[PDB]
């Protein structure tokens, strides 16, 4: 019942823009912070961005700073990643991940208990 | 940036073996370590949080230990469904960082 | 046997007490405090009694 | 004359555990922080009762006799009671020692917590003398003293008057 | 104009020991160690004991003629016996399993 | 509107145990002191685990049977288990009572320790309202609020602006 | 350069547990609060001795042998010692864990209590830097530093000089 | 040995004044706060006034505020209740009650351990 | 003002009965409750303070229990001299308030 | 291996000056405070002066105040006592004593664990 | 100045005796008392510090007790090499002060 669904990935030329969507259901989406984690083909996991539950605070990895913007829609229970000035090194499978709560508090810095199947972004 | 160094990059073993994977951090991350299991084409699965706590629905043959800098993931008795790649993740501070990964493969 | 009633009895006298500990006698019968060899067990309830001169 | 908690307790404070002493034009006297005394009296009464009432014990027996050719069994009974005697004695001693140290710290925290409440009310309309007393930089009539003890002193009401008295000190 | 924060003191000579300090004067205290007994043999939760006067338990049970007969149905919370009873096993022989019997008949 | 820890907790603080609430021109909101929450979560998890994991016990047995003519030995076994039942029950009750009182004090100290860190940063660029909140004597934009929560607020940067706002209050 | 207790301890403080570091025209150096060190050394020595000396035990015996057809009695003796082993081991582990946490808190309170005494003396003749150090708003010669460490610094003596230095900062 | 003695009650017309007296003995009267409690015929107990040990602080029920004044005399070990503008609803038996001490402190807010026989005030 | 609601207004019982009287407060009064016994023409007598503590010289058949809002006075085994009216009093804050009262009467 | 060595004592006329030396070895001399203790013939022990480990703080008995000056040399591991305006009542055997450390801190106020043989000063 | 009053000024005893020497302070010195043994022509030797702690290499027949104002040095069983003069020293505050001294001598 509790699972995310990424979308919006595809083949894209260098320098163009995409917006990813992460549709959440089965849990109080507006209580959790959220993260985007990407995985290049054959490589490891890289965290790119995170946003607090109310959207007031946003954290970015240095590799996507100034080009990626994270955001969320409370009424749609959806998380977004706007990706600008795309580069071939941005090519990866992009996951949205939910940080685990503990002691009943939704701490944004924790392990990631829920992931979607991911969406593929190919820049070439 | 806190960097996690995972050893070994890969290991081969048979079913019923005991497998040790270590994760080393550049600085103290207390207990904010996670371990993930990833089969090809699938998203990672959370196995261990708090560097030792077993995640609900995960076999008791997976265990984790460590605090501060050095952490260890142990699979006591391997199963067929345990052949995958394993990642350690820190949750001490932003930016969130992962280990290089460890593939467990058949000999 | 005297005309008295106790919740704890020893062969040298009755311990009619609900205090948790007693140093009276090792053997007893009934609802009794735990035997200890402490001479005093005094809990502070008030404040440090260090009055200004 | 008349100093505060830094230099010790008050023989004149008789109607409570924690309180205040004041001096203004209309006079002086002691007055207990009744509510703070209430809240601490409950805590101390609960602690003593918990240490006492939690000793819920099984029925104690004196049947510890074995026959003449079973002295080894009697010795086993003797050392069993010795073991519990050592366990209860040691735990009881350190229980009292630990709780007594904590009880005195409990009173210190309560006293300090009255001192902080008055300090944050007066702000800079008063000078902390460092002995548990405050040097009001304005006239504080009996209504003013009661407002401080009730937590309803107004900073901005005496704020101008205090400012002029402070620049004289400077 | 002054206001001070203070606490209570009295003339109590009582002292307590803390885990850091010894013989600290305190304004009030409470002992949790019972050190006194009333020196009496009493009822136990309102249940009388069985007094053997000057007979041992085997003598009373078997009916030593010098011992009071149990004339009526009775109950007791414990059995009181004299340290050196005057009337015991009047005819020489061992009373078997006395300790086990005490477990059965001490509280009835 | 919106008061601090002196008057109770916040239902709106959901992403941590301890945190802050702010109000300036650009808006308002809650924000958790993530690091302080981290450090306390480790402490509480360690305390519970220590109370649980330290119970390292010998192998428990149920062989407590003696023959028909050894009822006195059976009674000795019965009262041995009664003794340990009383020991463990009493120690377990007061362990939980003592630790629960200390755990609540632990949270209070952590909250007070955030309050002191903000108080010593703002110095007299703000007025302590006495309810766990501070009345900034200057405009504090969203960058300013983040600097306070990160421990990088500069006293001398807003010092002139705060001084003029204070003499108006006087 | 040279920060206080907020950022950690001092390798240069060798003649006491708690102390001060100063800097003025005539130089700099470390100096231990001798009396505060005295009072804490007594407390720690008493705590260790109480934990050690209160273990007043009955005479320990090794006579635990029963005959060949009494193995059940031997097992009862075996599990009696197992029970006390579990009781003492668990109580000893958590005694040390609880006291160690309290001992570290004890040192923190003592350090904080020196910091409060200096803070209430200097009042606003100094600026709290937030790192355990104070920025004296006047010249404080070696006599002045000793008066602060002895609790005999006078607020009103340097009060005018500090006021002029403060309005420059404003 | 420890007991109070009320006096001064009687039949009184509406709007007139009475002063009650409570003579204390057997205990350190000047250490305790004191209270007046009245009981209308056939009705329950109503607390009317209280005074601290040194007389500096005084507490009144709303029903007698501005009309009743409590006071004490240290040298005479006597407590007083001055009753002005008496009304028929003031008719009651008037008791002076001593609040119980606890932990050796004479707290004014507690149970009432000592009462006198009472004195009767009838307003009609 | 804290209001104390005593139940029942009255009850009839015989000697040796168990009698329960309750006292309900509008707000938390922690432990500052008292119970009084009053015979006609006589002043009230203090029975229970601290909502459970027995007053010196009062039989152990009177007991009290409760904390915060709900309090109970129990007479385990009634005696002839226990037929009277009983009041609960709060001591939490001024003004001091009493319950409506409970008369214990013979059937 | 750990022992002090006093020197510089001798016969001296009233009003003259002497300087005593205390050569330390076998221990970290610059971590300890040091004391001078003198003993008149047939009389008890009298503490005269003490100095902190870094020499910044100096303590004197009233009987030698303004006339005696304590000092130390870190590089020579030597302690000094300059004695001016000598009087017949200054005649004594002069010891240099090391205060004991405890809990690993070199507290100057403690018992004296190390003494030298002493040096004799006779004023006449 | 804290003054230490040592009793007795002197005592005679034989070998194997139990010897008690007391030291009385004008004010509380908590535990900062020391005991010294001095043979003629030799410097004092530290026996007891902290008013009870035995100094390394000192026989267990020397013991000290006391706290605050009254302190006691006890030699349980005298030896030939124990005939000397004994001093108590306070370490509570400057100036450091000693007791008058106690000579233990043969009868
Ligand atoms: C053989 O020996 C054993 C040990 O002495 C006796 O067992 C004890 O029996 C007494 C009475 O039967 C027990 O005490 C009762 O416990 C009940 C449960 O208490 C728990 O729950 C309540 C809430 O319901 C808590 O308040 C309490 O703290 C406990 O957590 C209580 O409900 C009973 O209350 C009775 O007393 C109060 C006043 O004290 C009245 O107000 C009540 O209305 C009620 O009458 C009572 O406290 C005790 O717990 C037993 N202990 C053990 C170890 O068994 C046997 O009775 C004894 N056999 C014989 C024949 O004497
Ligand atoms: C008869 O009954 C007794 C009591 O039940 C059994 O004895 C227990 O046996 C178990 C397992 O043999 C013991 O547990 C082991 O303790 C080892 C030592 O632990 C200490 O040191 C480590 C650091 O090295 C600390 O972490 C620890 O807290 C202790 O301070 C551990 O090294 C063992 O670790 C094992 O488990 C972990 C996961 O839990 C793995 O990661 C490890 O790799 C390793 O496999 C283990 O914890 C226990 O201490 C014994 N207790 C007693 C009282 O003897 C007997 O085994 C039993 N007999 C039979 C035949 O069953
Ligand atoms: C069989 O086994 C038992 C247990 O081992 C032995 O009993 C112990 O015997 C010793 C010595 O007889 C006891 O120790 C003594 O306790 C006395 C009382 O101490 C309490 O009161 C004093 C104040 O008066 C407190 O200071 C103290 O902390 C206690 O609260 C002390 O007065 C004794 O002091 C002796 O030693 C000190 C130095 O340690 C000297 O300065 C004194 O002058 C004095 O000589 C002493 O401490 C011990 O308490 C007994 N324990 C038990 C459980 O019985 C039996 O002796 C043993 N039988 C045989 C034949 O060996
Ligand atoms: C109670 O509140 C729930 C949300 O609060 C969350 O869950 C609790 C258990 C804690 O973990 C807390 O820290 C969390 O923020 C709601 O889901 C639930 O419906 C509420 N229940 C009611 C009856 O309103
Ligand atoms: C001591 O003081 C008594 C009065 O103090 C009261 O009683 C003590 C026990 C505490 O309860 C305290 O809080 C009270 O204020 C006098 O009655 C007594 O006479 C005094 N004793 C001496 C010897 O002076
Ligand atoms: C470590 O430091 C030592 C000096 O420190 C002193 O000794 C320690 C044990 C504590 O008592 C401390 O308070 C003291 O100041 C040196 O002697 C030693 O050589 C040093 N060791 C190393 C390896 O550098
Ligand atoms: C105390 O000050 C207030 C403030 O103006 C005033 O209203 C009140 O009358 C004063 N009371 C007395 C007794 O002077
Ligand atoms: C005292 O404080 C209470 C709030 O706790 C308030 O309702 C009351 O009006 C205050 N009274 C005075 C005289 O300050
Ligand atoms: C906040 O104030 C700083 C200080 O001048 C300024 O640099 C920054 O631009 C301001 N931000 C906003 C959003 O006004
Ligand atoms: C927050 O504090 C850290 C030090 O802990 C510092 O490195 C960082 O620059 C600060 N960032 C902000 C935005 O204040
Ligand atoms: C330090 O200041 C005081 C105050 O005037 C002065 O008396 C003293 O001589 C000064 N000391 C030095 C060394 O300047
Ligand atoms: C230090 O303080 C004490 C009081 O504790 C006082 O008697 C003494 O004169 C002070 N000395 C200096 C130099 O401040």
Author numbering:
A (entry chain C), H (entry chain C), J (entry chain C): 31 to 154
B (entry chain D), I (entry chain D), K (entry chain D): 43 to 149
C (entry chain A): 278 to 330
D (entry chain B), F (entry chain B), G (entry chain B): 5 to 174
E (entry chain A): 11 to 118
Text of the article:
Here, we present structural information for the human antibody PN-SIA28’s heterosubtypic binding of hemagglutinin (HA) from circulating and emerging potential influenza A viruses (IAVs). The globular HA head domain recognizes host proteins bearing sialic acid on their surface, while the HA stem triggers the fusion of viral and host membranes following endocytosis, allowing release of viral contents into the cell. Anti-stem antibodies exhibit much broader cross-subtype neutralizing activity in vitro and in vivo by inhibiting the low pH-induced HA conformational rearrangement, hence blocking membrane fusion. In our structures, we found that each Fab variable fragment interacts with just one protomer of the HA trimer, and PN-SIA28 recognized conserved residues in the stem region of HA by binding in a very similar orientation to the HAs.
